[PDB]
């Protein structure tokens, strides 16, 4: 199995134009759950989530999300008071875990104020890393509750991973599939005497792809331009890499290596 991850995001907006609160869950790049302050309901985002979780899951987490929504509103008000900020500001949260290919795990829990790092949980020392003195004030208050830190460590290391394993089974046909890339090299004289080489890949799943340009099989070419890995809209992805010009494009995707000699 490849590396997989589970994560839950929260967005809180003060004085919005836009919901006051949104929560979205993901398995890798796939949305799995959604909640907002308008619907006040937690709903599946993936048919394999809807098909496999009974209504009591959605009923229970809707109640929790309504409480988390209220807690987010109060916490953003306290942050604004600490910073002496008026107007519309954002509060964000990300919690999740990763199950690596080798069986080892990672877990993370972070907060952001106005889209910047604010508090970073360290589950190995059971402490919060504060970026400034407002975050330090919150860190001191939160660390006073040792039970909650321990609870968060247990959730990140044990509960999150068990949810991830459960969801990966539910979404097996989507998440554990391989759609190999369609790769081509395009050559063109651009500015006189200048040749541009593009290595373009599309139709692949998962989105994680490695592409590079090599010279005489050995050295990586200096000054490679990389294209972002973009969703094609049909569940597959596209990307590219280019160079100015014996050159070859090297592509690695889900245990398969590919060379396109120019």
């Amino acid at each position: 199995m490849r590396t997989h991850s589970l994560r839950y995001f929260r967005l809180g907006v003060s004085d919005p134009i836009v919901p006051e609160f949104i929560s979205v869950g993901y398995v890798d790049s796939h949305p799995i759950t959604t909640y907002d302050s308008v619907t006040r309901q937690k709903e599946p985002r993936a048919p394999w989530m809807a098909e496999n979780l009974a209504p009591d899951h959605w009923e229970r987490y809707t109640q929790l999300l309504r409480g988390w929504q209220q807690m987010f509103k109060v916490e953003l008000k306290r942050l604004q008071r600490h910073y002496n900020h008026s107007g519309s500001h954002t509060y964000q949260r990300m919690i999740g875990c990763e199950l690596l290919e080798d069986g080892s795990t990672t877990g993370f829990l972070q907060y952001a104020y106005d889209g910047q790092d604010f508090l970073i949980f360290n589950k190995d020392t059971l402490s919060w890393l504060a970026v400034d003195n407002v975050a330090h004030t919150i860190k001191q208050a939160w660390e006073a509750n040792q039970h909650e830190l321990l609870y968060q460590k247990n959730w990140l290391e044990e509960e999150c991973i068990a949810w991830l394993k459960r969801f990966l089974e539910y979404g097996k046909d989507t998440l554990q599939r391989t759609e190999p890339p369609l790769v081509r090299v395009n050559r063109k004289e651009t500015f006189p005497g200048v040749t541009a080489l593009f290595c373009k890949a599309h139709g692949f799943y998962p989105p994680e792809i490695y592409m590079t340009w090599m010279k005489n099989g050995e050295e990586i070419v200096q000054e490679i331009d990389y294209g972002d890995i973009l969703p094609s809209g049909d569940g597959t992805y596209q990307a590219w890499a280019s160079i100015e010009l014996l050159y070859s494009c090297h592509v690695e995707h889900s245990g398969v290596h590919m060379v396109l000699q120019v």
Partner: antibody, heavy 108, light 113 residues
Framework: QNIDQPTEMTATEGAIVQINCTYQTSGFNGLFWYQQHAGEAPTFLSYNVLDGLEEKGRFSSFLSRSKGYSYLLLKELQMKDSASYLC??????????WGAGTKLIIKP | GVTQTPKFQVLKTGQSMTLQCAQDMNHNSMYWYRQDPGMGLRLIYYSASEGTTDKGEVPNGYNVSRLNKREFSLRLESAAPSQTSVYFCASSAAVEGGNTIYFGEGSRLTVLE
């Protein structure tokens, strides 16, 4: 989903009693121990979520997550320790599942 | 802590009853439990925060109102002899892990034909 603790336990004054709690839940988000005197409200004793033994005076709370087991250990037993001891486990959906309780009887 | 009333109540089958509960700990979550011999506390209704309530394990014959952040009342619409029990109101800072539950003194209710 089940939480199991003995119905009743009897020990002698000045001795030690270990009250076991086993749980079969889909997930685990912590284990509580409460003390409830006859005709009184339950009162908090401990919360365990990671592995180990936590000592609070004459009372200790142990947890083994892999074994799905906890115990409440009461040392130097006094008559005032005669009460029911309730364990509760928070499951994967944060539902608190309460055990039926253990009535502890102290023989003077 | 948690203040609940009344401590004792005798009701006739079919009568209405409201159990009051308040907490001064600025807690978000509130609960109503019933305690019956030989079984664990059973959740009737809970309120994860102000502005929301939901059914517990034994909601039938009851209803609740989260009046404000402090208050959570339990209503017996048409009391039945099976509703003879000890009722405990409870509160915690949040429903999530670790947060200590605080119980009220308990309400002993007896429903008679």
């Amino acid at each position: 989903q089940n939480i199991d603790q003995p119905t009743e336990m009897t020990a002698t004054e000045g001795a030690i009693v270990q009250i076991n709690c086993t749980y079969q839940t889909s997930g685990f988000n912590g284990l509580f121990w409460y003390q409830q005197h006859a005709g009184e409200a339950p009162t908090f004793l401990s919360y365990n979520v990671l592995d180990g033994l936590e000592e609070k005076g004459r009372f200790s709370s142990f947890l083994s997550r892999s074994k799905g087991y906890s115990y409440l250990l009461l040392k130097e037993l006094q008559m005032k320790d005669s009460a029911s001891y309730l364990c509760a486990v928070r499951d994967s959906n944060y539902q608190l599942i309460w055990g039926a309780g253990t009535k502890l009887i102290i023989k003077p | 802590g948690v203040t609940q009333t009344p401590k004792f109540q005798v009701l006739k089958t079919g009568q209405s009853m409201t159990l009051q509960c308040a907490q001064d700990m600025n807690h978000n979550s509130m609960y109503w439990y019933r305690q019956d011999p030989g079984m664990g506390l059973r959740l009737i209704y809970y309120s994860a925060s102000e502005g929301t309530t939901d059914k517990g394990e034994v909601p039938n014959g009851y209803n609740v109102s989260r009046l404000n952040k402090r208050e959570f009342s339990l209503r017996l619409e048409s009391a039945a002899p099976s509703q003879t029990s000890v009722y405990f109101c409870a509160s915690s800072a949040a429903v999530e892990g670790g947060n200590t539950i605080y119980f009220g003194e308990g309400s002993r209710l007896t429903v008679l034909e």
